[PDB]
Amino acid sequence: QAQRQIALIQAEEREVSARLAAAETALGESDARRQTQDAALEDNALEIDRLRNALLQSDLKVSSLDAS
Amino acid sequence: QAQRQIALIQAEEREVSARLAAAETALGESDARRQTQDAALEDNALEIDRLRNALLQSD
Amino acid sequence: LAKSAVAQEKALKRAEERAQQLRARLDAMQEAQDQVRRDHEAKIAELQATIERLTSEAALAEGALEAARRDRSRLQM
Amino acid sequence: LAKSAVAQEKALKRAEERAQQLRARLDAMQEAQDQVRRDHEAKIAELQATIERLTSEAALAEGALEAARRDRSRLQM
Amino acid sequence: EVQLQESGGGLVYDSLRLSCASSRSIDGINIMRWYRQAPGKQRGMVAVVTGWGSTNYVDSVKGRFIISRDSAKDTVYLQMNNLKPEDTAVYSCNAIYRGSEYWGQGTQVTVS
Amino acid sequence: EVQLQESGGGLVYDSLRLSCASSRSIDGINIMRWYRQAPGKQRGMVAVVTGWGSTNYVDSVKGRFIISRDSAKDTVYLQMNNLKPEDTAVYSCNAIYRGSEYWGQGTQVTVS
């Protein structure tokens, strides 16, 4: 028995470099991609606002001119 | 020496179970939210793509 | 802030299932004491009697049966 | 509604420690059984052994009180 | 109260067997033992079995008796062979429950 | 193995004690007992106690010799009171651990 607990230890160490690492390696995947989309959301918001407000900034000529 | 190898086996498995437990819950939901945040942000990503045309038609 | 408000709403609902899901195993395996060990305490008492009587039975069987027997076999005298 | 996430942030946080705290008691109760499960292995043997060579003295002691008791009938009668 | 039940009487000039069954409190058995009685004389142990089934006897039957148990059916057995006409006595199986002893009817074994 | 370095007896006519000390195993005490013997004869017990406070005596040492436990020191107390003339003998305490029995010296008590 004591040696079949010894046999487990190697296989137990095999399981951590296995699924254990697969989970760790996937952790770097999400946070890396999370920062890409997170930072973009600020930039994508930055790109939206300049032309969403310019929409209001430029359209305003549609009504004021028509008085003429 | 049987107690020696045993002493680690409950010690190691508990540390093992912890990282099986933590990583599984760490990855999962953050994965679920990331795909939604992708869906959340990419659907109104065309919102600018729709309005940039709407800006240029009248300007 | 619709998707953010809704997200926390479905977020809590799973951890409150773990609240039962982790007090489910606790309720069961805690009952593994209240009967398994408590009766296991009784068998010690049950086995305990026999060490009270083998001494009592041998109390007469060792002394009295030898206070007179070896006295009776004093034919050497 | 604007703050309603703030309240729902804490249930997303409080339920987390109820997960954290509770599993600790699950950690303890396991060795509260296993170590005892090594104690109730030695006690039976250490108690049953002190009986398994008590019948071997309840009998062999009577061997002198039966192999030599056959001699009294030769003269008593 | 608890009950016992004996069996196994017989004669030859050689084949013989004994049994002592019980109908209640089955297997609730710590140390229980076997006896023989010389006619008009006293009473003493002959063979024993216990919780772990350890083997030990009275000196008169070393190499003579083999005793074995069934936990379920509650009927312990003994091996009687190569008899000598001087072993004859009156037998009555024994058992102690909760610290109290309990005798049965009692029988005899004779060879002559 | 225990070292039951027993002592306490005497050689007089008024009030005596048989105290069998310990060396290890503070109340690792399963069945443990005492023996006496008269010269020209073999051994015999006097009083036996068991770790469950149950105490029983042989007929003779009743009313005069008293056995009691003290787990706080692991020293069985076997008081010698009302020393009658017959009480002359040679004594020795006993114990049983791991199955393998252990013994000691004991002393000579002679009161007439």
Side-chain angles (χ1 to χ4, degrees):
Chain A
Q1 195 185 355
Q3 279 71 65
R4 65 178 64 88
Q5 285 93 22
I6 297 169
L8 294 171
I9 292 318
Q10 184 35 269
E12 179 180 4
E13 295 150 342
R14 295 177 186 176
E15 298 140 26
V16 306
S17 59
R19 45 176 81 62
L20 256 225
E24 271 166 40
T25 43
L27 183 143
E29 302 169 357
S30 295
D31 280 308
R33 300 151 202 189
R34 190 270 303 161
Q35 277 189 8
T36 67
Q37 292 105 35
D38 189 16
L41 190 148
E42 295 184 1
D43 211 334
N44 304 352
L46 283 180
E47 301 144 2
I48 287 170
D49 300 333
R50 293 183 179 183
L51 313 166
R52 186 176 178 87
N53 289 319
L55 183 63
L56 193 149
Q57 275 282 350
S58 183
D59 291 331
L60 171 53
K61 293 186 286 184
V62 66
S63 57
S64 63
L65 281 293
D66 205 356
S68 49
Chain B
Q1 277 74 251
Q3 300 185 358
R4 297 179 174 182
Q5 193 84 30
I6 284 180
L8 282 176
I9 197 177
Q10 293 82 17
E12 200 49 28
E13 181 36 43
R14 286 200 159 194
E15 285 187 2
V16 172
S17 51
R19 286 172 94 200
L20 276 296
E24 190 276 331
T25 187
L27 262 172
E29 293 294 329
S30 289
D31 269 357
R33 196 186 214 177
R34 198 271 299 169
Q35 312 295 154
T36 60
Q37 293 179 356
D38 286 323
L41 181 60
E42 287 165 357
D43 307 340
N44 52 6
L46 300 178
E47 167 273 338
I48 190 177
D49 295 326
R50 301 160 259 202
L51 62 83
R52 291 190 169 186
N53 297 114
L55 184 65
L56 267 296
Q57 304 151 216
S58 61
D59 280 9
Chain C
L1 277 296
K3 293 204 177 193
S4 185
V6 174
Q8 268 186 349
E9 281 326 290
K10 64 182 181 293
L12 182 62
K13 291 298 294 297
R14 65 184 183 272
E16 62 86 20
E17 293 296 329
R18 296 175 188 92
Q20 296 294 321
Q21 188 274 331
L22 212 51
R23 74 169 55 88
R25 183 215 292 249
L26 193 63
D27 280 346
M29 204 211 65
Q30 183 64 73
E31 291 315 349
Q33 294 294 108
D34 295 309
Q35 183 62 255
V36 170
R37 73 93 176 166
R38 277 198 211 149
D39 270 351
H40 180 94
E41 280 186 355
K43 186 179 74 66
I44 283 294
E46 197 271 329
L47 184 67
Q48 189 274 330
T50 197
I51 196 66
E52 311 197 321
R53 184 51 71 61
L54 267 73
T55 65
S56 167
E57 289 179 352
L60 276 300
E62 186 74 8
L65 299 184
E66 293 279 35
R69 169 73 212 282
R70 290 151 180 179
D71 189 358
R72 284 179 192 170
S73 191
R74 283 182 179 169
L75 291 176
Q76 273 171 316
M77 175 253 289
Chain D
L1 183 63
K3 287 176 187 174
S4 180
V6 176
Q8 293 324 81
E9 191 170 3
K10 279 189 179 177
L12 183 63
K13 261 65 180 175
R14 274 181 198 159
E16 271 176 356
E17 68 249 18
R18 264 141 51 191
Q20 273 303 10
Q21 286 178 359
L22 195 144
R23 65 179 177 87
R25 194 251 300 290
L26 209 72
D27 287 351
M29 294 299 291
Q30 202 204 308
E31 51 275 20
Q33 216 181 1
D34 180 295
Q35 188 274 331
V36 167
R37 274 311 160 171
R38 305 165 186 172
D39 186 74
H40 287 286
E41 282 205 353
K43 182 63 69 177
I44 299 299
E46 284 182 355
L47 180 63
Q48 197 80 262
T50 61
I51 290 171
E52 61 86 20
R53 186 179 67 189
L54 179 66
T55 58
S56 181
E57 183 143 0
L60 266 287
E62 281 217 340
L65 286 176
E66 191 66 358
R69 270 192 216 174
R70 251 195 179 168
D71 293 347
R72 58 159 170 250
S73 63
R74 276 175 185 173
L75 286 178
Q76 291 177 351
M77 294 298 103
Chain E
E1 282 180 343
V2 65
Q3 193 145 312
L4 287 176
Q5 191 47 257
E6 288 106 339
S7 293
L11 277 296
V12 294
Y13 289 168
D14 287 3
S15 48
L16 192 70
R17 202 210 169 96
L18 301 158
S19 292
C20 167
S22 76
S23 163
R24 75 163 39 206
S25 78
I26 302 299
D27 193 11
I29 319 171
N30 281 322
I31 297 89
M32 57 99 81
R33 48 184 191 260
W34 273 40
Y35 283 70
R36 68 192 192 186
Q37 186 169 3
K41 314 201 61 49
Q42 303 314 105
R43 298 174 32 196
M45 284 73 74
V46 65
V48 302
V49 302
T50 59
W52 291 353
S54 66
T55 67
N56 65 348
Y57 309 86
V58 178
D59 64 346
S60 84
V61 298
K62 313 322 191 73
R64 194 102 189 261
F65 290 167
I66 296 172
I67 191 167
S68 88
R69 250 192 64 181
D70 175 5
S71 193
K73 291 194 286 185
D74 214 324
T75 304
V76 67
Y77 307 120
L78 284 74
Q79 203 74 226
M80 291 65 77
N81 289 316
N82 64 8
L83 275 163
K84 303 172 184 181
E86 288 184 355
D87 295 302
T88 288
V90 168
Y91 290 81
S92 85
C93 48
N94 189 358
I96 296 178
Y97 292 164
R98 209 199 164 93
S100 57
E101 203 174 16
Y102 293 104
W103 303 92
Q105 266 192 332
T107 58
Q108 71 86 21
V109 173
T110 302
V111 54
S112 282
Chain F
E1 293 179 353
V2 70
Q3 286 65 251
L4 294 174
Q5 192 72 257
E6 190 276 331
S7 179
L11 72 165
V12 298
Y13 273 55
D14 305 85
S15 65
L16 200 60
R17 283 179 54 257
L18 294 174
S19 66
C20 176
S22 56
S23 179
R24 79 156 201 95
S25 66
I26 303 299
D27 218 331
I29 286 172
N30 304 166
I31 193 66
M32 61 80 71
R33 60 206 180 184
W34 294 78
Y35 293 90
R36 80 175 209 198
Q37 82 274 19
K41 317 163 67 66
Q42 49 276 59
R43 307 162 73 53
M45 66 182 179
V46 164
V48 59
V49 288
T50 315
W52 292 270
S54 66
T55 73
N56 51 357
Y57 296 81
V58 72
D59 57 344
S60 184
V61 298
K62 284 167 172 59
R64 286 177 298 123
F65 292 164
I66 301 92
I67 186 154
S68 65
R69 281 216 55 191
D70 183 359
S71 296
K73 296 183 290 294
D74 203 305
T75 297
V76 58
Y77 283 165
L78 179 53
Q79 168 83 56
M80 295 298 102
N81 278 332
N82 183 15
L83 294 174
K84 280 189 176 180
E86 190 277 331
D87 288 315
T88 70
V90 179
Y91 287 90
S92 77
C93 71
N94 185 6
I96 300 181
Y97 293 162
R98 199 248 190 186
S100 194
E101 205 168 20
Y102 315 120
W103 311 68
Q105 284 206 353
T107 196
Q108 191 159 16
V109 176
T110 313
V111 298
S112 279

